[PDB]
Amino acid sequence: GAPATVTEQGEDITSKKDRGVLKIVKRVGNGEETPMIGDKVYVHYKGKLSNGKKFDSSHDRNEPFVFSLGKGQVIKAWDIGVATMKKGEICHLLCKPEYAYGSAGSLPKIPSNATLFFEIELLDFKGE
Ligand SMILES: COc1ccc(OCCN2C[C@H]3CCC[C@@H](C2=O)N3S(=O)(=O)c2ccc3[nH]c(=O)sc3c2)cc1OC
Structure with a gap:
């Protein structure tokens, strides 16, 4: 699979x-x-x-996820990955734990030492 x-x-x-x-x-x-x-x-x-x-x-919530790029508001894989995307792009990202939640994980859903898969669509970006 993907x-x-x-x-x-x-x-x-x-x-x-x-x-x-x-x-x-x-x-x-x-x-x-x-x-x-x-x-x-x-x-x-x-x-x-x-x-x-x-x-x-986010699709299941009917609203996008919004963050400021490159500020550590998200896991490292996202700051790195989203920075490579063009508007309207959809990508798949495979994130080893060192670029995600590490040994800590993130309760309740993400275990320790977790490799994560994301599908991401970049809807828009704007400077503030
Ligand atoms: C600078 O270091 C960090 C900064 C922010 C961090 O996390 C907050 C930002 N953040 C939110 C989302 C979407 C963006 C991707 C990622 C995320 O980073 N999560 S996630 O989809 O993987 C995800 C995780 C648990 C979880 N539990 C749920 O019930 S739903 C859910 C979803 C972590 C950092 O590393 C300690």
């Missing part, structure tokens, strides 16, 4: 090239511009654990 495919066929987008964050572009977005640090970014996403459980979805 998590296996990004694991086996994804591109390492980390600066360290430690394969901590792998990406596949599923839908090509618009133009060439990607968001900049500090931009308010609007995304839709779903997350799955490596045991197959869906742990989160």
Whole structure:
């Protein structure tokens, strides 16, 4: 399935090239511009654990998830991954725990040492 495919066929987008964050572009977005640090970014996403459980979805809430890019308001994989996206792009990200919740996890849904899969759609970005 999609998590296996990004694991086996994804591109390492980390600066360290430690394969901590792998990406596949599923839908090509618009133009060439990607968001900049500090931009308010609007995304839709779903997350799955490596045991197959869906742990989160913005679609199911009928509202996007909004954060300021590059400020550690989200896991490292997202700051890195969303920074690579064009407006309208949909990607898959495979996030090793060092770029996610580490040994701590995040109760109730994310265990210790969890590799996470996300589908992310970049809806919009704007500077404040
Ligand atoms: C700078 O370091 C950090 C900053 C913020 C952090 O988390 C808050 C921001 N944040 C929110 C969401 C969506 C964006 C992605 C990610 C996220 O980071 N989670 S997530 O979908 O993986 C996710 C996790 C648990 C969970 N439990 C639920 O009941 S639903 C749910 C969803 C963690 C950091 O690393 C300690």
